Symmetry: D2
Subunit: 431 residues, 4 copies
Amino acid sequence: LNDDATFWRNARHHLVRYGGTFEPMIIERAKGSFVYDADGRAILDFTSGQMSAVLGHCHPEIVSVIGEYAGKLDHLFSEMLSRPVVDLATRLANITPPGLDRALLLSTGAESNEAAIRMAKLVTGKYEIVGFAQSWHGMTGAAASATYSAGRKGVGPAAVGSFAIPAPFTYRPRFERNGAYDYLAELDYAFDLIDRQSSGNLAAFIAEPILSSGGIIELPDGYMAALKRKCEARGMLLILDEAQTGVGRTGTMFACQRDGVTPDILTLSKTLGAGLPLAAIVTSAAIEERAHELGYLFYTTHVSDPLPAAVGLRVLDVVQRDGLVARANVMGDRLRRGLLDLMERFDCIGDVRGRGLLLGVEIVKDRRTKEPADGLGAKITRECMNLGLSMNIVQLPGMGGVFRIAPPLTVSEDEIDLGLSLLGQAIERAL
Amino acid sequence: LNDDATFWRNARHHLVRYGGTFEPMIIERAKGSFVYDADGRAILDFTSGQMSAVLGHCHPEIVSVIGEYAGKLDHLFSEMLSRPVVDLATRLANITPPGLDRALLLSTGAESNEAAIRMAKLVTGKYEIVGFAQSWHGMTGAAASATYSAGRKGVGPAAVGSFAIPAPFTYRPRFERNGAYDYLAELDYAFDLIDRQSSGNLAAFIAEPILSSGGIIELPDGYMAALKRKCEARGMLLILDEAQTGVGRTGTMFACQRDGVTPDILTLSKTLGAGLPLAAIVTSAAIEERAHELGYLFYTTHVSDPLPAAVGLRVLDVVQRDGLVARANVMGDRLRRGLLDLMERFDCIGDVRGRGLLLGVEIVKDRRTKEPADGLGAKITRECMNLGLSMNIVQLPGMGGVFRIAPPLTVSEDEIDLGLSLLGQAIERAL
Amino acid sequence: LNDDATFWRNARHHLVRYGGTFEPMIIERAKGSFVYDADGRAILDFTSGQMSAVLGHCHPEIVSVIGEYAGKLDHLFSEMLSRPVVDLATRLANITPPGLDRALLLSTGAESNEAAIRMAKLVTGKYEIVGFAQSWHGMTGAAASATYSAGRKGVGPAAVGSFAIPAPFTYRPRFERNGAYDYLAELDYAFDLIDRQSSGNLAAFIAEPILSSGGIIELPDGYMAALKRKCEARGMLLILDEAQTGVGRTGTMFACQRDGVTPDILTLSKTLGAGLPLAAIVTSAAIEERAHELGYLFYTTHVSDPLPAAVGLRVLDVVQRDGLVARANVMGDRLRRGLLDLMERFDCIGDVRGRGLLLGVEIVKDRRTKEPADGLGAKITRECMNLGLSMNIVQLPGMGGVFRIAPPLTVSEDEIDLGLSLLGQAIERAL
Amino acid sequence: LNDDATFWRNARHHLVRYGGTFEPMIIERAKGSFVYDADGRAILDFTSGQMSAVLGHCHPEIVSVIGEYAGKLDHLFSEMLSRPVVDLATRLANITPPGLDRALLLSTGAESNEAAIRMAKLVTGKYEIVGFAQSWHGMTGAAASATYSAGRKGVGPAAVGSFAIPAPFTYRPRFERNGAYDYLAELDYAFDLIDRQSSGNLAAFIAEPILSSGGIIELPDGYMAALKRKCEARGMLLILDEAQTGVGRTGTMFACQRDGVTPDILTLSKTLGAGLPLAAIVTSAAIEERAHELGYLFYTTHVSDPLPAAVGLRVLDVVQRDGLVARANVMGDRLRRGLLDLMERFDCIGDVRGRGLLLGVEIVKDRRTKEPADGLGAKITRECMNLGLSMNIVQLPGMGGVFRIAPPLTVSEDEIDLGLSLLGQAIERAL
Ligand SMILES: *Cc1c(COP(=O)(O)O)cnc(C)c1O
Ligand SMILES: *Cc1c(COP(=O)(O)O)cnc(C)c1O
Ligand SMILES: *Cc1c(COP(=O)(O)O)cnc(C)c1O
Ligand SMILES: *Cc1c(COP(=O)(O)O)cnc(C)c1O
Ligand SMILES: [K+]
Ligand SMILES: [K+]
Ligand SMILES: [K+]
Ligand SMILES: [K+]
Ligand code: NA
Ligand code: NA
Ligand code: NA
Ligand code: NA
C-alpha cells in the first residue's frame, strides 16, 4: 500500500512544506508516460512531471548518456571547459534563430532568468523590469520580483523597479476599443502608465510566450512584435522565458519562432533538461561582448558542468531525429479535438486553448456568465487521480480553474485516447 | 592537443563569459583526484572541482546510484513524494544536530540560501538581512544582496534592508581593544551600528562558518556563540551557509558542530551533491510549522526529485562508512604540516589557515609588512598548472592572494605528498 | 528699467536655477490683484502668485495681523503651546467636515503631505502609496515619490512601494466601456493591477480633487466616492491634498465638500497661508489617537509657531466674513462665460474646465483632432506678458498646453473683465 | 492662570501630537531672551526657541522689516524675481567662503537638505547617501533617511542607498588605535565598510559640524578635512548641514570656517530665519551649472519669496553690525566657565562641550563609570521650569541625558548669570 506508516511518519516529521499538498501515494517507479505507485498502479502522467519530461520518464537514450558520463566526466571546476559544454552551446546557437549566438549553461529556470535579468541590467545601465501580472518566472530573488501570478505577499519588499502590465487575455477581455477587444491598445495604454512611473531606468521586459501558471494564456497575434517594438523604443531588452514552451512543446522548436520575433535574451529550462537540472540562456554576440567588457559575472558551482550539458545535447538530438516537434503538432491536434468533444458534452468546460502539446481547459459554471466553478476543479482533479490520470489545475483571481495538460512529446495515440477517457469519466462523476 | 582549433573556435563564438578566464585545455575525462586533458595528462585536482567533489570524480557508488535511478525514477511532479526524498530528508534530520528537523531538497547553493532567506522573512515578518563584508552566498537575487566579496557593482540596487558587518579576521586585525584584537568587541561595535540603522525589521543573519571566497577566514573562538546571541536578542534567525564546509570537509559532519552552536536554518549544497545539483535547507520543526501556517512557498521544478535525492543519500552513506570525516582530519593534518614546511622555506607564504581538508595559504611579499604579493599568485598558479596541479586563488581588497586548497575527502597519502611537491616546485620557479 | 545691469549680473552669478526661466523683470511692489515692475507697470496677477494669494497681495488684515504678532509672539520652542495655534487648530476642526478633528500646523505643502504620508504608514503598518499619474504633491522625499506629473527622472530610485493609477480625464478619454468612457471601470481595471502588484502593504492613496499641474483635471462625478470605497476595501487611508483647492477657491470651503466624501487625512497649504508659509494636516481623532499610541513624530522648527498660525486664522476669518467662498462662484461664473466666448471666437481653445476660481483653458491646434498646439501657448503667454497679464501654462505628454487661471478670491468685476480682454488680444496677436 | 480649561479642552481635542509633551503653560508673549506665560511670568529662553532665535524674540529690526514688507511685497509667482531675493542670494555668496557662489531660498531645514540631496544625486548620477549614526536632518523623505538619531522605526523602508557611519565622539571613545582613541582610524575603518557595501553609487555625505540632537557632539580636530578627503576620493559631494551652527552661533559665521574645509553644498535654516521660515542652500557655480544643464528642479510655492528673503537679509545685517559673532565667543566664554564651576560643585555633570553659544552639559551618575543618570535629567528639567529657565534635554542610547544650551546671540551678561543660577538651584534641589 501507499499507506506505509513509517514512510508517512517520516514524511510528516522531516519534510518542509513548500506549497500545495503532497499526493497521498508513494511513487515507486516511472517509465514513458506513466508513473507507478507503491501498489503497482500506473498513473498516466499528463503534466510531464513538473512540465519537463518532454521525452517521458526514463527515456532509454537519456539513460545511456547519463551512464556514459557519470563514470567519465561529472563535475568540473568552473573555469575548465569540456566537450559536452562546447557542443551544447553550439547546438543551441544553430537551432535558435539568427541573432541568438552565445549560451550560458546553468541549472534551474529561475537561475536562468536571474542570469538574464542581471546581464540586461549590466548591459543597459538600468534596473527596472516589467513583466505580466500573471507571470511565473521562479522563486529566487529577481525571478520572484517579476513573478506576479503568486507568492508576492508576506515576504518583504520586492526588488526596486518592479512593474507589471496586464497580459492580453482573449477569453476574458477587459480592455475595449470601440466595440471590440483591442489588445494592442491595451498594450499602449499599459506602456503609457509605465512610462509615467519609470524613473528613467527601464532595463528589460521578461515574457512567457504562453503564460503557463497564469492559466495557459496565449499571447494573441501580433502582440509580441508590438511588444518588441515597445522595448526597442525605450532601449529595453526583451527576455523570453521559454522554460515550458521551448524544445518543441508548442509545435516549433521555440515558440518565439511562430511569432517570428527573436528576443534579446532567450531563457531555457524544464524541457531542456527533460527532468534534470539543466538550464541555459542564449543571447546575441553583441550583448555578450558588451556584457563581457563591463565585467558580467554569473559564476556558480554547476555552470558548464559536463554531465548536464551532455544530457541536454541528447534531448536535443532525440527531438531532432524522431521529429518530435512535428509529433507535438499531430498528437496535439489529436488531444485538442478530443477536448473539444468533451466541451460539447459538458457545460463546465468554458474554453480550450494552447498550442501543440501545451493545452489548457478552463472550468466554468456556465458559459453565458463564464462564472468560475468554485471547487468543481478539485473534484475533477480528485476523480482523475482515482482513475489514474495525473492532472494539475491552476486557479487565479477572476478566472476559472485551468487544467494544464502537457503530456510527453513521445505520447502515443493510445495514451492520449486513454487520458481523454479518464478525463471524461472524472468529469462525469464529479457533477 | 588541447589546441583543437574547431573546439576553440566554437567556444569563442558560442559561449557566454561569466567571469574568470577559461583554462586553455580540454578536459576529456576525470577520475578520483585527477582530471585529464585532451593529451592524457593528469592534473591533480586540488580544489575538488568547484569545491564540491567530496568523494572525488566518478566515485563508483555515485555511478551505481545514478545508474539505478536514471532508469527507474527520474523526475516527478512537485507534489508527488517518493522514497529517496523521504529517506534523505530523514537522514539529514538525524545527522544534523538536535534542533534541525525538517529538510527541503533543491538544486543549487544560491537556491538553498534563497529559500532560507525567504522563510526567515516569512517567519519574522521582517526583511532586513545582515551578512559579512566578505561573504559569498550565490548569484541569484537575495543570495546576491547578502554577498559582499564580489559582484556588487554595476547591476542596479541591492535588495532593501541589506547590511553587512566585518568578518573577524585574525591574520589582519583591525579592531583593537586595549592592546589586543578584540573580535567580540568588534562584533558589538558592529551591531551597535546596525541597530542604529535598522528600520526595526531585522529578520536574519547568514554566515559562512569559514569564509571561503573571502580567503578562507575562520570564525575565531566563541564568535559564533556570541553571534547567535546577538541574533537572539534582536529576534533574528541565524542561517548558516555550510555549502563548502558541510559534509565532513572541516573534520566534523558540519562545522556548526565544532562551535556547538546550532543555527535556525542550515543550508547545504556543493558537498551534498558531490558534483551534482543537489541542495537543501534544514530547519527546526517549530519554524517549519510556523512557516507552513503562514503559507510558505518555494516551489520549483526540481524540488523533491528522485534522482538527486538518491545521489545525496549515497554521498552520505559513503561518508558515513568509510569514516571520511575522520580521514579529513588525518589527511588534513598531513597537508597542513606540509604547507607549514613550505612556509619555512619561502618568505612569500604569510599564513596557513583553515580546518580539515579546507585549507588556505596567504601569499605575501614579506612577513614583516605582510604586504600583498602583486601578481606573484598568478605566477604560482601558472606554474602549478604546467606541473599538473590544479589550484585556485582568490584575491580581495587589503588582502594578499589566498590559495584555496580543498582536495577530495578520499585523497590518498601519495596524492597529497604529490601536490605538496608540485606546489613547492611551482613556487620555487616563480620567484 | 527692469534692465538694471547690476541686478541681473548678481542674479546670474548668485542664484541657483530651480526650474523654468526667470521673468525678465523686477517686481518692485504688489497690491490686490496686481504686481508692479521696476517701471511702475501693473501686471494683473491671474495666478494669485504661486496659486496662493487667495486674498490678494498685501491684504490689509494680513498686514495687521503680521504686525500685531511680529512684535508680540513670533517663534516658540516646539513643545510650548500658544493661543493662535490652539485657535487655528480648533477653527479648522469646525470648518472641515465631521470626521476631521485634529490639526498639525506646519510650513509647506510638501511638508504637510510628508506628515500625512508618514502618519498613514504608521497607522496602517504598511508603506505602499498610490497616486495619480499626473499628480503634483511637492519636491521633498515622499511627496516627490507620489508626484508623477514631473521630476521623476535622473535623481535616483523612488521610494519603495510607489505606484500610480491614471487620473480620470474626460477631455481625452482613453478607457472605453461599451461605447463610452467608463471612468469607474477604468478605476477598477487600474486597481486590479495594483492589487496584482502590491506586496500586501497598501497604506494610502493621495489625491488632488482637481489635478492642478496635471492640467486642471477635475475628478468626474462619483469618482471620489468610488475611490474612497476602493481604499476602504483594502484597508488604505485616503489623503486629500487640498493645497490649491482648499479655502474657497472652487466654490466650497474644501472641494471634498462637493463630492461629499470626507477623507482620512486632509492636507492644506498654499491658500491657507495666502502667501506665507503655513500648512497643516487635519485628521480624525481615531487616527490621531492611534498615531499617538504608536509614537507618531513630526517635529520641526516651525510646527506650532505663533505667527503663521495667527496669519492663517485671519485668512480664515476674512474668507468667512466677506463670504469669499460665494464670491468665488460668482466671479468664477463671470470668468468662465468670458472664456467660453473666447472659445467661440478662436479655434485654438479646445476646452475650458475647472470650478470656481480654479479654471483651465486647453490650447489645441484644431478641435476635430484636438491636436496639441506646439508652442502656440508660449506665444500667447509672451503676448499676455507684454499686455500686462500674468498667466501660467502647464504642458504634459499627450496633452495640449493648459493655462491655469486662478485669480484672487477678492478679484473685482473690472479686473476680471480686464484680463479677459488682454487674454483676447494676446491670443489674437499670436496666430 | 495657565490652567484655562477652555484652552486645554480645545487643545486636547484638536491638536495632533507630534512628539514630546506640551508644556503645561500658555505662552502669551515673548521679548528678547524671555517668554511670558499667561500669568506674566518670565521664563528665560535658553534654547532660543526651537534653536533659532539668534537675535532673540521680537527683535525690533525684524519687526521693522516684516512690517515694511508685508504691506509692500509678500509672495510672488516662482518665476518672478525681486530685490530682497537677489540681495540675499548675493550677501550669502559674499559671506560664505570662496567656492560657495549660488543660493536657493526656501522655507525649512529639511526642505533645504532635500534640495541639497537632490542636486547631489543629479550632479553625480548616483543615489547613495551616508550620514552619521546620530544625525538629525529633518522629517521629510530624504532628510529622514539620513537621520539616525531618531524616528527610524515603524514607518516603512528607508530610501535605498542609505548608510550611516559612527560619529567621532570623544566623551565616550569606542575605537582604539594602540592605546588611544583614533578617530581618523575609526573613519577609515568605517569607510572601508561602506565601500564594501556600496553598489557603486555613492553620491554624497551630509554632516552636521556639531551634532546637535546627537548630544552636542563636536567633530574632533582634523576630522572634517579627513572626511572631505574621503568624499573626494570616491567622487562624493559633501553637504554640510549648518542649520544650528550657521550664522554666528559657534563663534564664526559658519562652523565650516573653523575647520577651514569648505563643503560642496552648504545648507542653512533655523538661524537664518531667526524664527521665521526661511532656509537656503549655497553651492559652487560649477555644481550649479552642472545641475542646470541636467535639468535640476526644486520648485515650491515659497522659493524666492520677497518677505522671507527680506527678513533674512536683516538678520544678516544685524549680526554683521552688532558684531554678534564675536559676542557669541565672549558670552559663550562666560556661560562655559559658569558651567564648569557647576561641574566642580555637582558630580552629576560629566561633561561640558560645544562652541560659542552652542553648549552641551552631559548628566551622569558618577564620573568614574560615567553611568547615565536615569531620569535625573527630567528632574533637573522640571526644576528649571519651576524656577523660570527653559531648557531642553536630549537623551540617546549609551549616552547620558544632554542639556542643549543655546541662548540668543544678543543675551546679556545678566541673563547669562541668571540662568546659570537657576540652573544651579534646579540641580541642587533635584538630588
Ligand atoms: C518552471 C518555470 C521557471 C522556474 O524554473 P525552476 O526550475 O522551477 O526554478 C521559470 N520560468 C517559467 C516560465 C517556468 O515555467
Ligand atoms: C558555492 C557557494 C554557494 C552557491 O552555490 P551555487 O551552486 O554556486 O549557486 C552559496 N554559498 C556558499 C558559501 C558557496 O560556497
Ligand atoms: C504646491 C503644491 C504642493 C507643495 O507645496 P509647496 O509649498 O510648494 O511645497 C503640494 N501639493 C499640491 C497639490 C500643490 O499644488
Ligand atoms: C532643525 C534641523 C533641521 C530641520 O529643520 P526643520 O525646519 O525643522 O525642518 C535640519 N537639520 C538640522 C541639523 C537641524 O538642526
Ligand atoms: K562547474
Ligand atoms: K519535482
Ligand atoms: K515651534
Ligand atoms: K514664490
Ligand atoms: Na541562432
Ligand atoms: Na538533527
Ligand atoms: Na470637522
Ligand atoms: Na562665498
